[PDB]
Design an enzyme around this catalytic site. Structure first.
Site, PDB file in Angstrom:
ATOM      1  N   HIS A  55     -37.865  -7.704   2.312  1.00 58.50           N
ATOM      2  CA  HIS A  55     -37.203  -7.358   3.565  1.00 58.50           C
ATOM      3  C   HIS A  55     -37.230  -8.571   4.526  1.00 58.50           C
ATOM      4  CE1 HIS A  55     -36.949  -5.227   7.526  1.00 58.50           C
ATOM      5  NE2 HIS A  55     -36.158  -4.401   6.868  1.00 58.50           N
ATOM      6  N   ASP A  72     -29.375  -7.580  17.753  1.00 57.79           N
ATOM      7  CA  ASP A  72     -30.464  -8.171  16.978  1.00 57.79           C
ATOM      8  C   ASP A  72     -30.915  -9.520  17.540  1.00 57.79           C
ATOM      9  OD1 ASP A  72     -32.350  -8.119  14.867  1.00 57.79           O
ATOM     10  OD2 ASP A  72     -30.791  -7.562  13.416  1.00 57.79           O
ATOM     11  N   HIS A  88     -31.816  -3.455  16.577  1.00 62.18           N
ATOM     12  CA  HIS A  88     -32.410  -3.856  15.306  1.00 62.18           C
ATOM     13  C   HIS A  88     -33.551  -4.861  15.469  1.00 62.18           C
ATOM     14  CE1 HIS A  88     -32.064  -5.203  10.906  1.00 62.18           C
ATOM     15  NE2 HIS A  88     -32.209  -3.891  10.858  1.00 62.18           N
ATOM     16  N   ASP A 135     -42.367  -8.866   4.194  1.00 62.71           N
ATOM     17  CA  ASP A 135     -41.748  -9.224   5.467  1.00 62.71           C
ATOM     18  C   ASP A 135     -42.377 -10.505   5.977  1.00 62.71           C
ATOM     19  OD1 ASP A 135     -39.554  -7.579   6.504  1.00 62.71           O
ATOM     20  OD2 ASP A 135     -40.976  -5.899   6.389  1.00 62.71           O
TER      21      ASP A 135
END
Length: 501
Positions: free
Chosen positions: A165, A197, A439, A464
């Site tokens: 991710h 974002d 986001h 991540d």
């Protein structure tokens, strides 16, 4: 200059994951937030870039992002390293990759290129690695012969729902762009209701840190290409898989300083890459108070697995970041809560840390994607709560576990919490009809230290990555360009918790 917030986070990481220092997390000095000439806050890459502009006709932020990605890749001499959630970069994101690589080759270079995406077990990849590779080669034209491609899609755990991710673009192990932005055409580019974002760009040692993180992912990915259920891999020009592209590029000499910014790079390995950090003596008393509203079917890696913490330092880095707040914390997220089941509804230690802050008189602001955003499991901007009450009620509950008094809980909660749905203008919805969607994976503390990256605060067991910066100057820019505007508009969609004036 003193770095009290980094120091605390560093203590946490070295206790949690000492063996992962230098690969999955690393503190470095001497970085530079990579802003263009005459735009000092330009290292902060917001999309679509339309504060107070409901029409959002121009979308300058998006154009700046794509421009910066292209330029960073254009400057490549040796290595281009890209990770994302599936699909492989398309639309304008792919154009940026193609154009940059063509410029790099035109400048006499033969870049090695890794492109890695994570895929959920239920997600069907339309353009698989071999087809994506072929597509790039076509677009690259005569330059293709000079470009070494490694393209792969990966899933590290089917039962524990784990895959990459992280969202990274690392060039020559010296520039890095990371954040929440997926290189996905349909969320940012070809749409009338673009997702809000934030990415950031830096150069220096922390870019190499990012590279070392991708090397850890590609070591696993290359090895596990022996199992097509987990890894699909395609290379070009007959090239071998390149597990240690970044280490080869780094060599023996230390990364050269580009500025004066101190940074902790930190990521996590999810589930299925590495079971634990064998050198870790980490021994927490994992939370005893279970969510009174949901039970996980799956083993709870977020709340009840010591080993998982040791190979996922980013979880504790975020908790210790928040815990380092002495004055105020701003949290800007898609979600604080996850859909339960199959995932735990929330990170107990995070919520207890927050409650602790509220009780101590530390100001806490939480801005999340509007609950009106219902999307499928995979989509950015969706919400996993029906009401903001699901956040404040939980804080109230934890406050009660803490103070022993509900009146005490109310004074803390009502006096020190700001809680709202994201807005970027006076408009509640796009002209689209659709609501605004957030986001961000951002946390800022005491206008001194902040995280920007791909790791959500809501429970997820993915690979991540992100950066935590400590710089009052940089945090001032963040406040000015993002946090103050966010609250200026979002406060119009603020919540007043139950039991509050």
């Amino acid at each position: 200059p003193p770095t009290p917030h980094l120091d605390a986070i560093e203590r946490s990481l070295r206790d949690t994951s000492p063996g992962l220092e230098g690969s999955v997390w690393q503190r470095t000095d001497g970085n530079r937030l990579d802003a263009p000439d005459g735009d000092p806050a330009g290292w902060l890459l917001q999309t679509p870039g339309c504060w107070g502009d409901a029409g959002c006709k121009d979308r300058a932020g998006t154009r700046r992002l794509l421009d910066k990605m292209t330029r960073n890749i254009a400057d490549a001499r040796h290595t281009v390293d890209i990770s994302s959630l599936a699909p492989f970069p398309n639309g304008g994101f792919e154009d940026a990759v193609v154009d940059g690589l063509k410029a790099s080759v035109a400048a006499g270079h033969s870049p090695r290129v890794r492109i890695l995406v994570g895929a959920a077990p239920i997600y069907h990849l339309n353009v698989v690695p071999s087809r994506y590779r072929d597509e790039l080669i076509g677009k690259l034209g005569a330059a293709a012969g000079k470009v070494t491609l490694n393209v792969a899609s990966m899933t590290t755990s089917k039962t524990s729902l784990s895959w990459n991710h992280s969202k990274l673009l690392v060039v020559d192990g010296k520039t890095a762009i990371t954040g929440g932005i997926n290189t996905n055409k349909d969320d940012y580019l070809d749409t009338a209701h673009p997702v809000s974002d934030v990415d950031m760009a830096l150069s220096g040692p922390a870019a190499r840190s990012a590279g070392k993180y991708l090397d850890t992912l590609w070591d696993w990915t290359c090895r596990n290409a022996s199992d097509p259920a987990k890894v699909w891999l395609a290379t070009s020009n007959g090239a071998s898989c390149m597990p240690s592209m970044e280490q080869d590029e780094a060599g023996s000499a230390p990364a050269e300083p580009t500025g004066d910014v101190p940074v902790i790079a930190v990521g996590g390995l999810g589930v299925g890459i590495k079971e634990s950090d064998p050198s870790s003596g980490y021994h927490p008393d994992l939370p005893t108070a279970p969510d009174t509203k949901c039970t996980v079917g799956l083993h709870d890696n977020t709340n009840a697995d010591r080993d998982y913490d040791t190979v996922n330092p980013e979880e504790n880095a975020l908790r210790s970041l928040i815990a380092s707040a002495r004055s105020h914390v701003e949290i800007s997220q898609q979600d604080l809560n996850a859909t339960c089941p199959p995932l735990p509804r929330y990170d107990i230690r995070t919520y207890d840390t927050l409650a602790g802050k509220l009780a101590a008189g530390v100001k806490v602001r939480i801005v999340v994607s509007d609950p009106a955003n219902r999307g499928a499991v995979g989509s950015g901007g969706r919400s996993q709560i029906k009401s903001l009450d699901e956040i404040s009620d939980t804080l109230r509950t934890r406050l009660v576990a803490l103070t022993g008094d509900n009146e005490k809980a109310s004074r803390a909660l009502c006096g020190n919490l700001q809680l709202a749905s994201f807005r970027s203008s006076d408009a509640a919805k796009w002209a689209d009809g659709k609501p605004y969607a957030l986001h961000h994976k951002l946390v800022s503390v005491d206008d001194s230290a902040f995280y920007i990256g791909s790791k959500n605060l809501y429970p997820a067991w993915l690979q991540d990555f992100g950066y935590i910066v400590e710089s009052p100057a940089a945090a001032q820019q963040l406040k000015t360009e993002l946090l103050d505007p966010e609250w200026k508009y979002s406060q119009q969609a603020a919540a007043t918790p139950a039991g509050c004036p």
